[PDB]
Symmetry: D2
Subunit: 477 residues, 4 copies
C-alpha cells in the first residue's frame, strides 16, 4: 500500500508518439532529417522506419486519454516539440534575460496552430483528473538550430546543436515562453529528458545511430557542458514566470560489482555517469576545460529529480580504472538469458528490479530531493515478461519509500507502443499494443495488471506472485 | 457477442481439488491407493506427489467461489466422489447374475433408494449439500457429474489387477460395478435434484478404458496391458451410462448428458481425408452411435440394442489439441511431433508452440469438433473442458481468447453451444503427473493454499463480465509468438 | 601414453548388431517376440523398430573388421546368442556337473550352421590381430526358456526366464559348451553383460519397455538371486574346459553427493547398487537375517571385472535412507543441459567423465582385480559431443592407471550404430554412422580421432584440447 | 574425385596472423592505429583486442607449414605487408599531377626499381623470402597476394579522415596511393618471381571501399560515411589493380589475378528473380566488367577505357554465405534474418544453422557463384576463401565437406576451378571483431601460441591426401542437425 498522494501513470515523448494521423507531420527536426537520410539508412544506423507512420497521438489523443482513465492512471509526463512551436529561424552563459517585452516578441514568431493544438491536448488531459508534468525537451532540435548531416560529415560551419551556445540561449527563452503560456495547466516542470544520452550516444556511442553521430570525446564534453548551462538558464527562465517545481529527467543504471573486490569500481562508475552531472546543477561543482570550480549561476537549480531506470550495469576494477562487462544489463542477446541466468527483453536488456531500489535510495541519501520514477518499462511485444517486470519494479519503489526516500509517483514507459528512435517501431514498450495500419489500441494483459495496481493504489494480494523473475525454462535461452 | 443464455464458467474434479485441508482425506479409492503404491512410485508410473497435499476445495470452497464470482463466472461443472458417499461394501444383490454379459435394466424404486440411504455416509452427503448451496448462492448454473475416474476400493483393487490377479474387485471389468453405478447415479439425483440444473453421468470414459488398459506408460489404474480387457471395460462403461441415464430419469426430469475427451483429427496431406474419417469412427462415432442410436458391437457381432438407444440429452465436448493422421495400406496412423505427442515447452513439426504438457496450440480444432458433433446428432453441447498447462501464464491468454473465438464461430455456423467451461479455476492434482502440471486461471501456493490471479484470469473476467471478446482483447485471438519461447 | 600392453577397441552385442542381412534373422528370443508384440507397440513400450532391419554384422562382419583394423583397434568384446546355437527345447544351485559325455550329448542338439558361422566370424576377427573377449550372454534368452508376454500378463505357468532355476542350470551348460568349442579362439571370457540392468528394468523400471515388464520388487530380487548363481555355475563350467580368465560385465554409475553432507548417502548407494553384488561373487558374502553368511560355492568366482560406465548419479540423504535426484546423470532432458550446467546427450545422459576415475579406483581399492573398461559411449547422431566424450574419458582411464589401478583396455560403445533395445535405431552410439537402407558405414569425425588415439596408444598433443566439456552455449538448452 | 592437378590448401592474411611474438609488431599501418584508437574502442567500433597478441606466424611459420604438410595440403595464398617493406615515406614524384583523375600508366624500368630498392627494408624482405622458401620446400604451390587491407601510415592516417579532415594522407581517396601501389607490386614481383607460381593484386577491394565508407558500423577504417567517397575509393582501387597488373607483367610472365568477396544472391519469392540480377550487377558484375572488358563509369556516364581492358588472368572466388533479396518499387533490398545478417549460434528464418558470426549455412551458393563467373568470363578460378567461425567445431565438418562437394559439382558442369583454399589454417585476428571469431582448422591457444587439431582438420586431411571426398566421409555433405544446436 502506497501513500495517499502517490500517483501511478505513464511517460511519453512527442517525436515518438505524435505523428501518424493526417496533418500531424513535423519535418523540421534534426531527428526527422536524420532518420530519412539515405546514407544513414544504407549504413544501418537507422531502421528505415519513419515516424510519420506512428501511433498518431496528435490526432487521437482523446482515445489515448480514455484508455489511461479506464486504467486508473493519475499522472502523465509529456513534452512539447520545440520545432512545432518555432519551426522558422529567429533573428559560459551565466544569465539569459527574460522579461515581458521579450516574451511578447517571441509570441509574434510562434506557430499559433501548434500552440492551440497542444492546449487542447493538455486541457483534455487535465479534464481526466491527470496530474501533469510538462517536459520541455525530449531530444529533437529545430533544424534551424542543428543540421546533423553536416556535422556528421565533419563540417562545423552550420547550425551545430548543443555544440553552440546559440542553442543554450534559445532553449532558455523557449522554456520560459512555454511556461508563460501553459502554467495554468502544468503542475510540475522538467527542463529536459536524459541529457546524458543525447551527449553520450550523439558523440561517443555512434553505433547507436543517434545524431549527429560524430565520434569525439572532446565534443561530447562540450555538448554536455552546454546542456548543463541550458538547464540552469531554463530553470531561471521558468522561475521568472512560474512558482511551480522545476526538475530534470535523467537516464540511470544500477552499477553492480562483478565480484566483492569491485566495490570501488562501482563508486567510480557512479561518479563518472551520475554524480558529476547532478553535483553541477545542484551544488554548482563543475570542471571547465581542465580546471575544477564552483559556479554560482549553476548552484541550486533543481527542485526534484526524475529517475529513469530499466536495467543494471556490471563493472569490474582494472589497473587503469574500471570497465563494464558485456552479457549483463544493457549488453545482452535479445530474447535470451544473461550470464547471470536472468531473462532478457526484445531489446537485450536484463531483468533486474533490485537496481531500482539501489538508484532511488542513493539519489535520496546524497541530495535529499524528492523524486518521480519517470521511466520504467520493457520491450515486449508478446507480453511474456512485462507482468513480472511491472509488479517487481513497483514493489522496489515501495521498498524505497519504506526506507525513507521521498518518491511521489511511478510513470511507466509507456502507455502505448511508439517509434523507438534508430530502432524504429519493432521495439514495443506499450501497456497497449498499437496496430500501425488502423491506429487501434489493444490491452495487453499487463495493462489489466496495471489497472489493478493503479485503481487500488497498491500491489493487491491477488497479483503478489508477479513480484518474481519470469520463469526462464519456458522462454528462449 | 454470445447468445443471451450462454454462460462462461469452469470445470473441476473431486479427486484433483478436494483434498488438502485437515479431515478432507479420502483414502478409499483405487486412485488413492494407486498413487501411494511403493512399486508404482519406484517405477516412475506416478509422480510421488500425494493428493492429500492439494488445493483444499473441501475446506476452502467458499474462497474458490468468491474468486469465481469476482471473475464474473455463471456456470460450474463438478462431480461427487462415489467413495465419499459409500465408503463401505454393499451386500451382494439377491437376484443378479454376474456372469451375464448385458445389463439391460436396473430397477429403481422408492424402497430401494431408502435401503441405499441407510448405507450412505451422511457427513459427506451434508457437506456436499453445503458446497453446492454456496455455489448456487453466487448465481452459478450447476452441472453435476456423477463420476470422474476414482472408484470405491471395495469395487476396484487396482494393485491386484496390475499383478494379473482377477479374483478380486475388478472395477469396470465387472458388471457388479455397472449395477452399483446406476443405483449410485439415481441415489444422488434423488438427494440433490433441487440444486442441480443439468446432469452428466461420467467424465471421459474413453480415457479411463484407454489409458487404464492400453496406454499403461501413462500410469493410470489398473495398468494391465490388454486390448481385450480394454474393450470389455468400454463395453461395461457404455451400459453403465445407459443404466445411469434411466436411473436419473426415474427421479428427475432434468437433462442428462455425458462428458467425453476429443481431439480434432487432421490430415497430414490432402490425400489423407479418408484417414481422418477412419480415426473419427474409431475414436468418437462408435461410442456415441451406441448411446444415442443404440448401435454397438458385442463380441464379434454388430447389433442394435433397444436399452441403449436414446440415452442422451446433451453432449459435453472436452478439447485441448489435435491429432494428425495419414493413410497407410493397413489403415491409418497418428504422427508424433503434433498434437498430444510433442516435446514440452517447445514447437511442433508445424511450427506451433507446445505447453508444459507437450500439447500443441490448435484452436481451429474446437470448431471442427463442435460442428461435426452438431451435424451428426443435432444435440446441444457444452464445452466442458478447455485449458492449458502453463505455470508462467505465457500462452494461456492467447489460448483462452482463441478458443472462445472458435466457439463463437461454431455458433454462427448453427451449432447449439450453450456454455464454455475452462479447465480450470485453480491449479490441482493432475493424476499421475502430480502438481507440476498447472492448469489454473488461479495459481495455487500448496504450502499456504492461497490463490493468486494469473493475468489470464483478468482476461477471463473481461470475457465473462462482457459476455464477449471485447475489442480491447481481440489481438489475443492469435498464436503465441514462438520466437521468444523455448524451442 | 599408455602401457605397452594396453589395448583400445570396442564392444558389441549380438541382438543389437547381427541382423540386417539375408539369412540373419533370429526370431527365437524373448526380446524378438517382445519388440514385435502388438500390445507393446500400441503402449509405446517399444519403438516399433524391428531388429531384422539392423546393421547386418552377421553378413557384413568382414567390413566391420576392415574398418576396425584401419582404426588401429586391438581388442573386441562380442557375445554369442544362446538362441542361435540352441533354438529348440532340450529334454540354491550349488553345482552343475560338466563332463565329456554331457558335452557330446549337447553337441547333438546344437545348430551346426550357426556354430560354424560364429567360427568364421571369430577367425576373421583374430586374423586382424584383435584380442578377443567372448561374452556368453547379452540379455535375450531362447524362447523355450522365457515367454515374456505370458509373464507380462501375470501367468507364471510357462517358461519364466531368470525366475526359474531351469535357466540357471541350462546357462551353466551353455557356457561350458561354448568354451569347449571356441577356447582356441578366445583370449578371455565374460559370463554375462549387465545382469543388474536385466533384473532392474525387467521387474521394477517397467516404463523402460524391457521384458517381461512385470512390476514386482519380490520377483526382481528372485531374478537377481538366480542370475548370481548362474554366473558362479557358468564360471565353474568354463573352468572345467579352459584355463583362461573368466570375468563379468556390470553396469555402473558414479554416485555423487548433492552437498558435502551427503557422503554417507553415496556409500549407501554404492552398497545397494554395486558392492552387494560383487561381494557375493568374489567373497561369497550374502546377507541372511541381519548376519553375513558365506556361501562356499560362490566365493572366488571372478578373475577380472568389466567396468561399464556412461554417467553419474547424484544422491542426497533422507531420514529413511537416500534418494537419487532428477535433472542429473541418467535423468536429464534430451539434448539439453543438466541442473549443474553440463550438456546432455540424445538419450538425456549427463557429461561426467570424472565418474569413470571414481568407479575404476574404487573397484581397485576394494578387490584389487584387474579391469577392462568394457563400455563407454554416447548417443550422438550429429557427433557434436562424442569427440570431447571420447578424449575426456580416455584421459580419466590414464589417470586411474597412474593412481595404480590395473586397467588393461578401453572398449568404446560402439564401433557402429545398432538397435538400442526398446528405443530402436534412433539412439546412435557408433563411431561409425550406419545407413540402414544401404548398410553402408561412414566415419564420424570422432572415429578419425579414435584412430589417432588407438594407432599411437596415447592422447596425442594435437588433440589434448578435447579433454574438456563440450561448449554449452552453441548447443540446445 | 578431383582433377589430377587440383590442389587443396588454405588462405591467410599478414595483419591477422603475423604478429604475436616479441619483435614481430608492425605499428606502421592505418589498421594498427585504427584498432588502438581510444575513441574507436569506447564506441565499440573495435573489439579492444590487439593484433600484437596474435598467433605469431612471423616467428612460428615453420610450425604452421609443418602442420599444413601433415594435413596433405598442396597450395597456399599469402600476402606481403606493404608497411613492412616500406615503413617510411617515399619522396613526392617529380612528374605526376595528383589532381588528375585517371592514372592510365605507371612507368616501370630497371633503374626505377633499383632506386626503390634503396628505400626498402631488407631484413623484412629477406624474412619474407625465408617464409616463402620454406613454403616451397614442402611442395606447396604459392599464390602471392600483394594487398590485404592495411596501408602504410604515411599513405593513410585513418583517424584524421574519420574526423572529416582530408588534408592528410587519405588512402584510396588519393591517386598517390594508386601510383605507389603499382610500383610496390612491380617491385615485389621483381624480388620474388622465382618463388611465386601465380599472383593476386589485392584481396576483397569491394569490402575495403564498402565497409570503409558506407558500412561504418562494421568498424573498418576510415569509417567516414559517404556514398561519393565510396565511389572515388573504388574508382582509384580499380586503376590501382590495372597499373599493378601492368607493373607485374613488366617483370614476370606468370598469371595475375584478383581476389573478391562474393555472396550468392537468392530470391525471397519466385517473383524476385529480377532483384537477384540487379544485386549481382551492383555488387559483382560492374567491378569485373571494368577490369576485364574495360567498361566503367567515370563520374556521370559510361565509357570503355583501353588501359583497364584485359587486366586479369584468373579470378579468386571468396564465398561464405548467401544474401536474400526482394523486389521493391525503387529497386531491391536485402533481408535480415538470412545470410550475413542472422543471430549468432542460432537458426535463420529458413531454418538453417548459423555460425559464431551469425552467417547462414548455404553451400549451394558456392555452385551458383562459380558457374556464373565461368559463364560470363570463362577465366579459370581458385576458391580463395571458404570457412566458418566455429570454436567448438560443431558445424565445420559439415561446412567443409558440403562446400568441397559443390566445387566438384561446378567442375562437372564445366567450370575451370583449380583449387580450394580454406579460411583458415589456424585461428587469427578477425579485424574489428578481434580474436573471438575462430576460423581455424587448427585451434590457437593465444597464451602459449600452441596449435591444436580440431576434428575438421582430420577430415580435411582425408580429403587432401586422397584428392577426393572419400566414401567414408560422404555423409558430411549435409546440413548440421539443428535440433541438438541452440535455436
Amino acid at each position: 500500500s502506497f501513500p495517499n498522494s502517490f500517483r501511478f501513470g505513464w511517460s511519453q515523448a512527442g517525436f515518438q508518439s505524435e505523428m501518424g494521423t493526417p496533418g500531424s507531420e513535423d519535418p523540421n527536426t534534426d531527428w526527422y532529417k536524420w532518420v530519412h537520410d539515405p546514407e544513414n539508412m544504407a549504413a544501418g544506423l537507422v531502421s528505415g522506419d519513419l515516424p510519420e507512420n506512428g501511433p498518431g497521438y496528435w490526432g487521437n489523443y482523446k482515445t489515448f486519454h480514455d484508455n489511461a482513465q479506464k486504467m486508473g492512471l493519475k499522472i502523465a509526463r509529456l513534452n512539447v516539440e520545440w520545432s512545432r512551436i518555432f519551426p522558422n529561424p529567429l533573428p559560459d552563459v551565466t544569465e539569459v534575460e527574460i522579461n515581458e517585452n521579450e516574451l511578447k516578441r517571441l509570441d509574434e514568431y510562434a506557430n499559433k496552430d501548434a500552440l492551440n493544438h497542444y492546449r487542447e491536448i493538455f486541457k483534455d488531459l487535465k479534464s481526466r483528473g491527470l496530474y501533469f508534468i510538462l517536459n520541455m525537451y525530449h531530444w529533437p532540435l529545430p533544424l534551424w538550430l542543428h543540421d546533423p548531416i553536416r556535422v556528421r560529415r565533419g563540417d562545423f560551419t552550420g547550425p551545430s546543436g548543443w555544440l553552440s551556445t546559440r542553442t543554450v540561449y534559445e532553449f532558455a527563452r523557449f522554456s520560459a515562453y512555454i511556461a508563460w503560456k501553459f502554467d495554468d495547466l502544468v503542475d510540475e516542470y522538467s527542463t529536459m529528458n536524459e541529457p546524458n544520452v543525447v551527449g553520450g550516444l550523439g558523440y561517443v556511442g555512434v553505433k547507436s545511430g543517434f545524431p549527429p553521430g560524430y565520434l569525439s570525446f572532446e565534443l561530447s564534453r562540450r555538448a554536455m557542458y552546454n546542456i548543463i548551462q541550458a538547464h540552469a538558464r531554463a530553470y531561471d527562465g521558468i522561475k521568472s514566470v512560474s512558482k511551480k517545481p522545476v526538475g530534470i529527467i535523467y537516464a540511470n543504471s544500477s552499477f553492480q560489482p562483478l565480484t566483492d573486490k569491485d566495490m570501488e569500481a562501482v563508486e567510480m562508475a557512479e561518479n563518472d555517469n551520475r554524480w558529476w552531472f547532478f553535483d553541477a546543477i545542484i551544488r554548482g561543482e563543475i570542471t571547465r576545460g581542465n580546471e575544477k570550480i564552483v559556479r554560482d549561476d549553476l548552484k541550486g537549480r533543481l527542485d526534484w529529480i526524475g529517475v529513469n531506470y530499466y536495467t543494471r550495469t556490471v563493472v569490474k576494477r582494472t589497473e587503469k580504472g574500471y570497465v563494464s562487462l558485456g552479457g549483463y544489463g544493457h549488453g545482452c542477446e535479445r530474447n535470451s538469458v544473461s550470464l547471470a541466468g536472468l531473462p532478457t527483453s526484445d531489446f537485450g536488456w536484463e531483468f533486474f528490479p533490485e537496481g531500482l531500489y539501489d538508484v532511488l535510495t542513493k539519489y535520496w541519501n546524497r541530495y535529499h530531493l524528492y523524486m518521480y520514477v519517470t521511466y520504467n518499462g520493457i520491450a515486449d511485444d508478446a507480453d511474456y515478461q512485462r507482468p513480472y517486470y511491472l509488479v517487481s519494479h513497483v514493489y522496489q519503489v515501495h521498498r524505497a519509500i519504506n526506507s525513507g526516500a521521498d518518491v511521489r509517483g511511478y510513470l511507466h514507459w509507456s502507455l502505448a507502443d511508439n517509434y523507438e528512435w534508430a530502432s524504429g517501431f519493432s521495439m514495443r514498450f506499450g501497456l497497449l499494443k498499437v496496430d500501425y495500419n488502423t491506429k487501434r489500441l489493444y490491452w495487453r494483459p499487463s495493462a489489466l495488471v496495471y489497472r489493478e495496481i493503479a485503481t487500488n493504489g497498491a500491489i493487491t494480494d491477488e497479483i503478489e506472485h508477479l513480484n518474481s523473475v519470469p520463469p526462464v525454462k519456458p522462454l528462449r535461452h
